[PDB]
Every structure is written in C-alpha cells, then in structure tokens.
Design a protein around this ligand. Sequence first.
Ligand SMILES: Nc1ncnc2c1ncn2[C@@H]1O[C@H](COP(=O)(O)OP(N)(=O)O)[C@@H](O)[C@H]1O
Ligand SMILES: Nc1ncnc2c1ncn2[C@@H]1O[C@H](COP(=O)(O)OP(N)(=O)O)[C@@H](O)[C@H]1O
Ligand SMILES: [Zn+2]
Lengths: 242, 241
Amino acid sequence: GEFMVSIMLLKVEDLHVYRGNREILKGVNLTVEENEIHAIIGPNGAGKSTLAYTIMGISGYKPTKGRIIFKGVDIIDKNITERARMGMTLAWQEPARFEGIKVKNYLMLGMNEKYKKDKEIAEEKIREALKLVNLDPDKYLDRYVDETLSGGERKRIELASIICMEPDLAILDEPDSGIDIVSFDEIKRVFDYLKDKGCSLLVITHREELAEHADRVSLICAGEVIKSGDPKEVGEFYKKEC
Amino acid sequence: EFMVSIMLLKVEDLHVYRGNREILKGVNLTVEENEIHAIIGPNGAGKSTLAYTIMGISGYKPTKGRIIFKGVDIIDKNITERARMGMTLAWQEPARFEGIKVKNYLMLGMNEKYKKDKEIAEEKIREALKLVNLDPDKYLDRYVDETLSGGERKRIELASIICMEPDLAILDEPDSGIDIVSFDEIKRVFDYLKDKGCSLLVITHREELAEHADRVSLICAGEVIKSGDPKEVGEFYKKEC
Ligand SMILES: Nc1ncnc2c1ncn2[C@@H]1O[C@H](COP(=O)(O)OP(N)(=O)O)[C@@H](O)[C@H]1O
Ligand SMILES: Nc1ncnc2c1ncn2[C@@H]1O[C@H](COP(=O)(O)OP(N)(=O)O)[C@@H](O)[C@H]1O
Ligand SMILES: [Zn+2]
C-alpha cells in the first residue's frame, strides 16, 4: 500500500451550542476516524454529554454556529431518525427502562440486518452478546428490560445491544457507569470486538482504565477541546491542569 | 459516664427475596454512630437491595432476619416512619422533581436546627452548594430536571444531605457521574457530615472513596465475605472477585 491516508467518519467543525441561556459548546473541533475508539474526557459541565446529544440530533440540541459532517454528509437538517438510518447510535448514561419488553426482544430491536436475515443467526447473536458482557443468556433472555434489572445489568444489556446493532458510529455516554471494576476487561473486550467489526466508538468516560484503551483521547473544558492525542499524556494533563 | 450504648444500625441475618431469586442470603452488617461504612462488591451481589431494604422501599421486605435502627425494630415501619427517625437514602440516578427550584429542593428535608431561623436556612443552602462546588448564584434558581447534568444532579443530592444532616445517610454510588478532579470535594462532604454526627453507609465502585471510609464491607451473592480495613478488604476484592 503506497498512500497513507486517514478517513474521517465524523467531523465536528467549530460547533457552538446554546442550551437555554448559557453557551455550552464554544467552537468544538472534533473528528472520529473509521475503525477508531476516540474517548472524550473532562470535568462536569464541560459539555461532553451536550456534544453527544448534538451529534445524535436530540430535540433541542441544534447548533447556532459550525457544522456536523457524518460520512461526508452535512447532517444539520436531519432528525435523530435520519441520523440513525445512516449508522449512528447513542447509548445514554442512564438507559431507559421499558415495561413488557423482554431482553431477547430488546436486543433484536436495532440488530444489524446481516444477522436479522436468518432467524437462527439472530438468535445466536443475542446469546453471543450477553456472553460478551458476562450475562448468562439462559438467566437474562427471559428477563424484562424494566426497573427489575440492576444498573450494572442494564448497562451490560445496553452494551450487548450495541454488539447486535454493530453500528458505524456508537456514541457511548459513560458505558462504565454502574459497572464494577473486575468487569472492566469485559468492557475493553467489547470495544475490541466492535473495532474488529469496523465500528467507531466515541466514548465519554470518567474511568482512566477505559480512556487509556482508546486510540485517541480528547479533553473538553468549557465547551472547548483543550488537548487531544495520546491517552496517557492527555489524561495526565487533565489530572494536573483543567 | 453513661453506660447505655445503642447501635445506630444493625442488620441481623437478613434474607431478602426479589421476584423469584433470593438476593440477600443472611446479611450481618452494623453501622456505628459517627462512622463512614463503605459497601463494596460486584454487580448483582445485592448492595442496592440492602440499601432499599434498610430504607423500607415498597417491595423490599425481608423473609428472614431483622433491621434495627436506634435500638428500634423498624420492620413494620414504612419509608416515611424510617425517614422521621433520621434515616435517608440517596438513590443511584436521583429523581428530577420538575417545577421545583434547587432552593426549594434543598429547603425540603432541611434539619430543624436550620429551618427555625429563615436567615440561617438561607445561609445553609448557599454553604451546601459551595461545599459541592456549585455556585449558589448560578444554581439556586435552576430547576431540578433533565436540564441538569448527571454530575450536577449528584452534587445537588449531596448538598441536600448537608442541609438535611441526617443520623444515617445511605448513599448508593454518590460518586457516579462525578469527575475524578472533584473526588476531594466528595471526601470533604463526608468529613463535614462526620463532623456533624452523621453516619454514612456508602455503596461505591471508586477505591478513592471506599478507602476514605473507617470500615469497608465486601458483599458477594447476598453475603458479607470480608469486613474491616479499607485497603485490605479492597485488595481482597480485586484478587478473589
Ligand atoms: N435548559 C438549560 N438551561 C440552563 N443550563 C442548561 C440547560 N441545559 C443544559 N444546561 C447546562 O449546560 C451544561 C451542559 O452540561 P453537560 O453537557 O451535561 O456536561 P458534561 N456531560 O460534560 O458533564 C450544564 O451545566 C447544564 O446544567
Ligand atoms: N423482580 C426481580 N426479578 C428477578 N430478579 C430481580 C428482581 N429484582 C431484582 N432482581 C435481581 O436482584 C439482583 C440484585 O441486584 P442489586 O441488589 O441491585 O445488586 P448490586 N447493587 O450489588 O449491583 C440483580 O441481579 C437483579 O437482577
Ligand atoms: Zn440464614
């Protein structure tokens, strides 16, 4: 291979986002490459979740200045459904509970077409995803994705949902939240498995254990990317300056 | 010189069944007056279930054993009866009570020693926000709703505990959603609460916070496996679990 190029999957250009009265994002320049794990670190109120919501096109999160480019398309006038059709997904910090929806049915919703095309393949995929996040398929398939699950179990089911979905870009807002340490290698193996399939993860995290697993980390302070690059160097700068 | 000694909280061989599964299988746990007792352990071990059973949350009734708070068996007392005795619970993922400003939220539940004088209560709310690093002038008139970030809502919940100043504050992951550059402020909140005579029963996944407790208890499959020194119990957890 002669040329060494980099492909951009997502490009956030000088993004200014106003929430209510306050200016949360003040010119964010962020890129996500194809098959890359890009972690976003920073203090509370810096605008990390707001950045994820603006990329997903959550109602109310429209930029006043700048633009979001996904797969070379300017997605500014596209609703959350139009962005999800292109291969983008968001995992919330506290995922929704649903009465009456079983775990098997929830993991089937959003499953990649390459698995849905054959019933037996889709059933094996759900079992594989639960085993990846350390949940016994025979104990959790019949459970409901409701208030009965513990936060850690719900967070693992959300991660299994991403495996089945196999999206082009998975934005994960604190995928570690509520999950015990000891289970942190399983989270890294999920990220590795997703990278192996061609996925790109944009992970917001407070765990250095997970942020150091990314290929690139970006520090965000007061709606601005302060530093970006090596996970350990950017992490050390965070723990000392901003 | 008064020999009458009363244990703040005493959980005796507690067996709790949730749905079909037996979550707690004989829990023996005690909380002393003016003590920070951390509870560590893997997911599904029953730590949150233990906190909900102590608070008397609807559906969390024990099949065997008993819960004794301030020498009183609270088994037949509802969550409101337990809260009047000085017990409180800070849920992991707190409620967004819309149409209620942060000033009203912090005033609901405030300790009587502060409510008795309007000026004292107004200074208490400002003090609590400053303790959790929130600027009172920026957050006092804000609404507790989805507008607040998880870290901000978790800090407001901690400020609420300062104003309340309870005898026993059960905190289910008080660190969750809070950045690591603010973990000293969480420890200073625990110190401030201990200084006032409060006892905290903190469930946590951060060794940073669990090592700040006077005693840590490891729970595995509804059972206390080890208890005592925070560093020794913490090392045993990473090793065997
Ligand atoms: N409607 C609104 N009115 C006022 N302030 C608002 C708002 N919606 C959001 N905010 C504020 O904007 C900031 C955005 O925080 P967030 O993007 O969640 O920060 P983070 N996840 O990186 O911790 C927070 O300080 C939040 O309270
Ligand atoms: N109604 C229910 N049916 C079945 N299982 C139930 C249940 N309510 C709770 N559980 C289970 O109880 C277990 C205890 O979870 P929890 O007490 O939150 O554990 P933890 N805080 O230490 O992470 C979990 O594995 C959960 O799935
Ligand atoms: Zn027993």
